[PDB]
Design a protein around this ligand. Sequence first.
Ligand code: ADP
Ligand code: ADP
Ligand code: MG
Ligand code: MG
Ligand code: NA
Ligand code: NA
Lengths: 308, 308
Amino acid sequence: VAAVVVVGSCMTDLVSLTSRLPKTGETIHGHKFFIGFGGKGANQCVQAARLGAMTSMVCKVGKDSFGNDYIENLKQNDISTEFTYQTKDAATGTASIIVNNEGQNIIVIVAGANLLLNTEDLRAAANVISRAKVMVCQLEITPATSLEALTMARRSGVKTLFNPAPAIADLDPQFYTLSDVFCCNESEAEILTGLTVGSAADAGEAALVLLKRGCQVVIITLGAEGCVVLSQTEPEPKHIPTEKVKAVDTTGAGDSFVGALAFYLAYYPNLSLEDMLNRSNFIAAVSVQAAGTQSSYPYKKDLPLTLF
Amino acid sequence: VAAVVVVGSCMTDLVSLTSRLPKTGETIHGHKFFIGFGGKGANQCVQAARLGAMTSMVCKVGKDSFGNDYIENLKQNDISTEFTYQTKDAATGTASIIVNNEGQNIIVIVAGANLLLNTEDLRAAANVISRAKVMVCQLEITPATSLEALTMARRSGVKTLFNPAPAIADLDPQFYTLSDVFCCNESEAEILTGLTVGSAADAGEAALVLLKRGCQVVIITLGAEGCVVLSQTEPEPKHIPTEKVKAVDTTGAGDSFVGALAFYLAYYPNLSLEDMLNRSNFIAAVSVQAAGTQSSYPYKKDLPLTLF
Ligand SMILES: Nc1ncnc2c1ncn2[C@@H]1O[C@H](COP(=O)(O)OP(=O)(O)O)[C@@H](O)[C@H]1O
Ligand SMILES: Nc1ncnc2c1ncn2[C@@H]1O[C@H](COP(=O)(O)OP(=O)(O)O)[C@@H](O)[C@H]1O
Ligand SMILES: [Mg+2]
Ligand SMILES: [Mg+2]
Ligand code: NA
Ligand code: NA
């Protein structure tokens, strides 16, 4: 049985490294190209799986080499692919990433087959969804499918962890009321609330707006400043610092955070949220010290015994 | 285009020969003074260059005569000096060496300009670093600078060869996780692990402690006993013996070994690690048969065709 079910996105990262980003109209030469496995859904599922969670990825890829490789990536990470669909109607979702020597990038995301994960694909997963402890969603598939995933879990008493990423300014009100744990970053919080979030006190203000909209728990991640959390039971914001560490590559750090939190929500329910968030901050602080997104997500074996 | 990029130290050896060593407060007269070229980084880079490698030395010397001389020493070794910086704020790195008839010595090393190589200098060197096949670093510049160089290489998919020399007891944990090949000698391994490392058996235990810290490959050099190698994909220590030879001067044999290893990592990447280390042993073994450190490093010209 999958304890953590993620309903969300799989994307092939297509990365070109250059000395400079190109300008409009120009063709430039880069020095290296490589492929990575990305997508917030898959990233979150991968971190939870490596921590030890029995996971299942509900998603859609293309009946192409990219999709075949993504399925094998999930299998290699011991993630169930029972409800990883393949479609001939769209290519596997893609992120064309151009990165210069300063780490500055330009990214073009084509959602592709991710947008074809539909409500019937979800209903076929009804039995896995109802036996899970945690249901994780984001906003890189059709919102209607994420909303239906949240409803099914909620109807079977499964804990919902929703990550409104990328953030939509007019996010449907029902997302908030279907979220047990609503987790986003400073930029998404700005988009969702219209407030400027450049400190932990600003994040506390923005978290209360998100909490008034119906979330049970709100977490706003703050990069190196850690995170701030509010709930319906303790609505006073509390800042939870993270480990002061030298960052090698912060890409996918939030996905490591969310995947870690999923694991603690499903396997350590009798821990306090503040403790779960301390541990999730730590795991995420470890991923920021390595390169390559999913390549940077640590295993249970390589973490202190004190986190389990 | 440089396949081997060495980010590290250059130092001017200021050698005085005497009959006896001086005691506190004593002025003695010596019989000869001469200048030599040293620094682990330059040593390594010279050996890789002599083997045929297209190399570049990212380093900082003084805007003084020692620095201009160092630049010409590098040029005379067919090394690119496009990233050899000069500074008005410190003297070129120096080793002041007094040697007596008995062969005893006192050495005073002043890092000097080496410690002023900063992250802006690395940022200006970013294209050469990211376009390399291997990036080599040691611990004779500011450790933060070496860590940032390893970070850049790793992010660009460039092979990192780290030589923690001279060794430091509380080496930042990221030095291990950012090292693809982590190479040191016996006494460096003893400093880094707190174990006795006298024999190949001892080196096996020590290399294992290092591999569990995050290294992909650990090599411990063992003088006349050659070296020991472990890896993530082969956690079992293997012993590569060297040539039994009549040593005349083993000074800088480690740097010969490392420069040779960088050459094979960059130009022969499909060779087995064992094959590379046996060739690198042979090369370091040739260096041991003459005096003069960089002076003893052999050329592709003067070596067996079977090494290539
Ligand atoms: N420099 C850093 N040092 C320590 N932890 C970090 C650092 N950057 C990110 N983190 C950790 O990763 C989590 C998510 O980071 P953040 O950048 O806010 O998310 P996202 O990746 O969604 O932008 C943070 O809450 C924190 O625990
Ligand atoms: N007497 C020797 N005979 C043959 N090879 C030697 C001898 N001394 C050193 N070497 C070679 O040089 C390499 C580095 O030597 P070592 O003394 O361990 O390094 P360091 O210069 O860091 O002290 C060894 O692995 C070996 O291949
Ligand atoms: Mg995120
Ligand atoms: Mg050495
Ligand atoms: Na990372
Ligand atoms: Na020698």
